Structure 1
Amino acid sequence: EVKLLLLGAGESGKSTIVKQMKIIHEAGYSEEECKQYKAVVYSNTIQSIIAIIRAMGRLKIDFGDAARADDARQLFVLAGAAEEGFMTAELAGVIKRLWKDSGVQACFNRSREYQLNDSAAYYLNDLDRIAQPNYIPTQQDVLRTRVKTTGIVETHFTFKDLHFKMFDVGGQRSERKKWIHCFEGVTAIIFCVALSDYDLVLAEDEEMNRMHESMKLFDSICNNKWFTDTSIILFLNKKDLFEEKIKKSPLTICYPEYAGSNTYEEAAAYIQCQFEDLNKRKDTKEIYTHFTCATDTKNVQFVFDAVTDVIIK
């Protein structure tokens, strides 16, 4: 009986790691379970297109083609069905024309300037498929869903003859007050960090850099004497989004003294060292770091397999 606790700031990938356990250790989501997320997919998709159109006003960005104005009006007239688990070929068209508009795209490419779901493009780019009549979300569609965790979620599974009890909590500031309820008998903590957060700000605070917040959290948990005997595993998550982002957005936004290049390998090791540096007992305490893509099942499988042997030692 092993107890794992998934900690980290909001949207770091904790719940997505939990979803993988089902796919990797069980048999993935059944049809009835996939259908349950159908409305979340649609809700997520409609909320993402609205967040972009909402930002265009704030940033004063015009549509590329004047006619998009009617489509934008139609969107709100029709948005209500989507939430109920319904997508009409009419609504689908509206969203598709909007998504392809150059002004909408220009706004999309300035997303660090507001709050947008990591999966907006994933879904918006796959509209034809997800809008089909009789659509049932795929395993990846489920993994891509965004649903806020509030409270404590407990999940169980068997792996390598061990019975796992995985604990997951909410990372927003207002939720952190609930973390101490899970502190008992923890075999290992899996601290999730979103690498692509380096240039974003807190949903709960536009004055606070998202990566700095994680550092504050990791420093706290890692050096908490209560966890002196718990294995600290660090997942430097969203390696796939970081890879694409490092090429165009400067890391000096987060770490002003970074003198390396806009490359993945070099910028990734740097962030690793920043976090590993917070450990105050480097000779007595070990940090087990892994770079991950929580939405990629094969990646998570090989990484979880390695993490368990560590737990098995």
Structure 2
Amino acid sequence: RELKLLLLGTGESGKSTFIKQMRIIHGSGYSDEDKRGFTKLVYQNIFTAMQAMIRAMDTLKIPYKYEHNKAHAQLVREVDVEKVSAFENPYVDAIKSLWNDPGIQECYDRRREYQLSDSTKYYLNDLDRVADPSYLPTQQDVLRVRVPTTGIIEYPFDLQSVIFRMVDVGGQRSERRKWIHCFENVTSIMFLVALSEYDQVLVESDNENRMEESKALFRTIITYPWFQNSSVILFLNKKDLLEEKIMYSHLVDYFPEYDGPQRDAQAAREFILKMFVDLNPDSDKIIYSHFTCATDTENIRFVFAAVKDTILQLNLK
């Protein structure tokens, strides 16, 4: 017996990462043949990230402390995103030096003002492993890669109880067009929200707030008449990023109705959660919330174990 599940959400919210975790836990775990597949994409993320950071220093007008690293910056600027074969010497030391420059660090700490990526610090803090000739990406490396999903894809995983046919999709406004065509017999909806979005603007529209886009998109999905029968599962992803961001960026600023103590993940979590829960048109319906981290297999196991049980408790009976 199969069940249709939609992973819906704003861009970069961890929909494709959630899938990668289902494959680790249930489906065909990541082989060492497959792990090589991502090596190229790892290198590209490091370039794409660094380049996006180099440009951002010229936008925000942040000075390089070591002026030597201006030569390395031009070196990296002309590197083509897609023409990356491997991570070799002329760029390795240049990109590590760049990263170690305290001007780049000021720019990185202002990552809210321009679109960077969510795994840049993870990779750039670990350039030694990446530049090794026989560098084989770990299961974490694979979870951390940014592979912009576009268009509907079906990933059917099967536990020893039931088949879950999960639907990964693209998050950006243009990708949301394609969504309509598999809204048919949906068992339940897994809506993902990135908790660290609160102080960020959309890539699809640098004017508007990412958290507020999700806030609207959730309300849109909820109120859809033919999901009245379906179950709703809210996934407040990137808990671990909120735990960093809230120490310097206050939630009070971007959502004025917040009373709680700033520099608190747990107080912010609950407020943010309530915002999404209060968008339910009728509290006669129940929204099942979980605070999650899609790059943590140990967290997704425990969560999805409880989520599966909720889906089946509800849908079998």
1:166 alignment counterpart: 166
User: In the alignment, is residue 62 of structure 1 matched against residue 63 of structure 2?
Assistant: yes
Alignment match, 1:3: 4
The whole-number CA distance in structure 2 between the counterparts of 1:189 and 1:240 is 23
Kept after mapping to 2: 8 A contact 1:4/1:186? yes
Contact 1:144 1:295 in 2 (8 A): yes
**Alignment correspondent of 1:39:** 40
- 1:202 alignment partner, SS class: coil
Question: What is the SS of the residue equivalent to 1:201?
Answer: coil
Contact 1:39–1:83 (CA<8 Å) still a contact in 2? no
- Alignment match, 1:256: 256
**Percent identity, aligned pairs only?**
53
- TM-score, normalisation: structure 2: 0.95
**1:83-232 → structure 2 map (5 Å cutoff):** 83-232=83-232
Which residue identity lines up with residue 9 of structure 2 in the other structure? G
1:111-143, CA deviations, whole angstroms, 9 ceiling, x for partnerless residues?
Answer: 101010011110111100011111121111010
Q: 1:202 to 1:81 in 2, by over 3 A?
A: closer
Q: How do residues 235-274 of structure 1 correspond to structure 2 at under 5 angstroms?
A: 235-262=235-262, 263-274=264-275
Q: CA deviation at 1:83?
A: 4.2
Distance 2:66 2:155 in 1: 49
Alpha-carbon contact 1:28-1:139 (below 8 Å) kept: no
Runs of 4+ in 1 over 2 A off after TM superposition: 73-77, 79-85
TM-score (norm 1): 0.96
Q: Which runs of 5+ in 1 are unaligned?
A: none
Per-residue deviation, residues 237-256 of structure 1 (Å, max 9, x unmatched): 10000011111101123211
Amino acid at match of 2:176: R
Q: Deviations over 1:99-121 (max 9, x none)?
A: 00011111111110101001111
Amino acid at match of 2:61: K
Q: What does residue 52 of structure 2 align with?
A: 51
User: Contact 2:54 / 2:77 at 8 angstroms: preserved in 1?
Assistant: no
Contact preservation (8 Å) 2:189, 2:233: yes
What is the Cα deviation at residue 74 of structure 1?
A: 2.5
Taking the aligned partners of 2:102 and 2:259, their CA distance within structure 1 comes to: 35
Higher mean displacement: 30-39 or 270-279? 30-39
Secondary structure, aligned partner of 2:199? coil
Residue in structure 1 matched with residue 23 of structure 2 by the alignment: 22
**Secondary structure, counterpart of 1:155 in structure 2:** strand
Q: Secondary structure at the match of 1:156?
A: strand
Distance 1:182 1:4 in 2: 10
The CA deviation at 1:89 is 2.5
Distance 2:81 2:307 in 1: 43
CA distance in 1 between partners of 2:82 and 2:88 (Å)? 8
Residues 209-260 of structure 1: CA deviation (Å, up to 9, x unaligned): 1111001010111122210111100000100000111111011232112121
Report if the CA contact (8 A) 1:38-1:85 is conserved: no
**Counterpart of 2:186 in 1: which secondary structure?**
coil
Distance 1:255 1:103, change over 3 A: same
2:312 paired residue number: 312
Q: Structure 1's 82 and 151: CA in aligned 2 closer, same or farther, altered over 3 A?
A: closer
**Structure 1 CA distance for aligned equivalents of residues 83 and 238 of structure 2:** 27
DSSP-derived class of the 2:207 partner:
strand
Query: What is the DSSP-based 3-state SS (H/G/I as helix, E as strand, rest coil) of the residue aligned with 1:258?
Result: coil
2:9 touches 2:217 (CA, 8 Å); kept in 1? yes
Query: Counterpart amino acid of 1:134?
Result: S
CA distance in 1, matches of 2:6, 2:110: 35
Which residue of structure 1 aligns with residue 298 of structure 2? 298
1:81 offset after TM fit, Å? 8.9
Q: Is the 8 A contact 2:44 2:81 kept in 1?
A: no
Distance 1:297 1:85 in 2: 30
